Amino acid sequence: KDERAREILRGFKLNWMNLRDAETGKILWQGTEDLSVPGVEHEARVPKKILKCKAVSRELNFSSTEQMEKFRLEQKVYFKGQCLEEWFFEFGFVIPNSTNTWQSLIIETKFFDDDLLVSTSRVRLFYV
Amino acid sequence: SMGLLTILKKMKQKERELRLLMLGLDNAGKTTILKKFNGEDVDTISPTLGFNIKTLEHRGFKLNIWDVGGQKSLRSYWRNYFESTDGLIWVVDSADRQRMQDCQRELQSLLVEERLAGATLLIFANKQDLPGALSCNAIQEALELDSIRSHHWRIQGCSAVTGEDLLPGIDWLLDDISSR
Numbered sequence: 001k002d003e004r005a006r007e008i009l010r011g012f013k014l015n016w017m018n019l020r021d022a023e024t025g026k027i028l029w030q031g032t033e034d035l036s037v038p039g040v041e042h043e044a045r046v047p048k049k050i051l052k053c054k055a056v057s058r059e060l061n062f063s064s065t066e067q068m069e070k071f072r073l074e075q076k077v078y079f080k081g082q083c084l085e086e087w088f089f090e091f092g093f094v095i096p097n098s099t100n101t102w103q104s105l106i107i108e109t110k111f112f113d114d115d116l117l118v119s120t121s122r123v124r125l126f127y128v
Numbered sequence: 129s130m131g132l133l134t135i136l137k138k139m140k141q142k143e144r145e146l147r148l149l150m151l152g153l154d155n156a157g158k159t160t161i162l163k164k165f166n167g168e169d170v171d172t173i174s175p176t177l178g179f180n181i182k183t184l185e186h187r188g189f190k191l192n193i194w195d196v197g198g199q200k201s202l203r204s205y206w207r208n209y210f211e212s213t214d215g216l217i218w219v220v221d222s223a224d225r226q227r228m229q230d231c232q233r234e235l236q237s238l239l240v241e242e243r244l245a246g247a248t249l250l251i252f253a254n255k256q257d258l259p260g261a262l263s264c265n266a267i268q269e270a271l272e273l274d275s276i277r278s279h280h281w282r283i284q285g286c287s288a289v290t291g292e293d294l295l296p297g298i299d300w301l302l303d304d305i306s307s308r
């Protein structure tokens with residue numbers, strides 16, 4: 001009844017997230033670890049000229065052991081003030097023991113199955 | 129604040145959204161085509177173990193393109209992505225004559241699937257760049273594509289690796305869908 005829910009939660013893993021320059025198709029920044037682990041919000045290196053890129057493609061890769069029937073995604077961009085970004089996407093079905101990819105074209109990310117929260121990811125900022 | 133800004137933004141606001149489903153046997157080249165749409169293969173490419181979804185923007189349409197892995201194990205799940213599909217894209221390895229029969233079999237199983245009843249069908253005879261890959265007419269004959277009656281369709285030769293002829297195929301597809 002929630003034993004299942006526990007299985008879902010436990011079988012989900014967000015491998016990596018990245019940022020590309022849409023006009024180029026080049027990876028500016030991509031990370032593969034500490035994406036959803038307890039602690040300091042993993043961050044990384046993305047060369048500041050991203051604001052000089054008029055188009056950016058965010059891509060996520062996640063694996064899931066359990067089959068889900070109504071998987072969705074909520075991505076909100078966060079620096080204090082009134083909010084800069086709201087992104088939603090409904091995947092629907094997810095195959096068991098699957099590895100999937102999602103990318104959008106132009107920071108806490110939440111994954112859901114109907115209304116059970118599967119995972120939360122928070123990453124942050126390098127205009128390095 | 130300049131008029132052009134609001135007019136363009138408004139133009140974008142009213143773009144129709146479309147769901148394109150890209151299927152085909154494994155190694156057919158589905159994921160490479162999807163990546164070449166954004167000019168991207170920077171050689172990180174292995175078999176797809178689920179789906180790859182890209183949300184683009186093209187020809188005034190907002191596209192949701194679902195690429196689902198075609199190896200044996202994943203095909204019984206294809207039907208889970210049927211609902212609301214505006215366009216079906218069938219990718220074929222033009223140089224893999226050793227599978228044309230399965231390829232044709234999967235395609236026909238898909239066309240009698242009621243949830244895909246009104247989808248426009250584009251066939252990408254991919255890998256045309258190869259030394260000895262088959263011709264469109266051949267593939268078209270081998271896929272019994274002349275035995276289709278419920279779907280608008282067009283076979284288009286192309287090469288995902290160089291991006292040659294990918295746009296003509298997508299353009300035709302977005303046009304037919306426009307007619308409704």
Ligand SMILES: Nc1nc2c(ncn2[C@@H]2O[C@H](COP(=O)(O)OP(=O)(O)OP(=O)(O)O)[C@@H](O)[C@H]2O)c(=O)[nH]1
Nearest residue numbers: 154155156157158159160175176198255287288289
């Ligand atoms: N020469 C050539 N090789 C191609 C072409 N398209 C794809 N390939 C190669 O064929 C292989 C399989 O291509 P993919 O795009 O991964 O195939 P796929 O349909 O996504 O396969 P699954 O993930 O199993 O469903 C890769 O090694 C690509 O580099 C093409 O037009 N020409």
Ligand SMILES: [Mg+2]
Nearest residue numbers: 158159175176
């Ligand atoms: Mg693939």
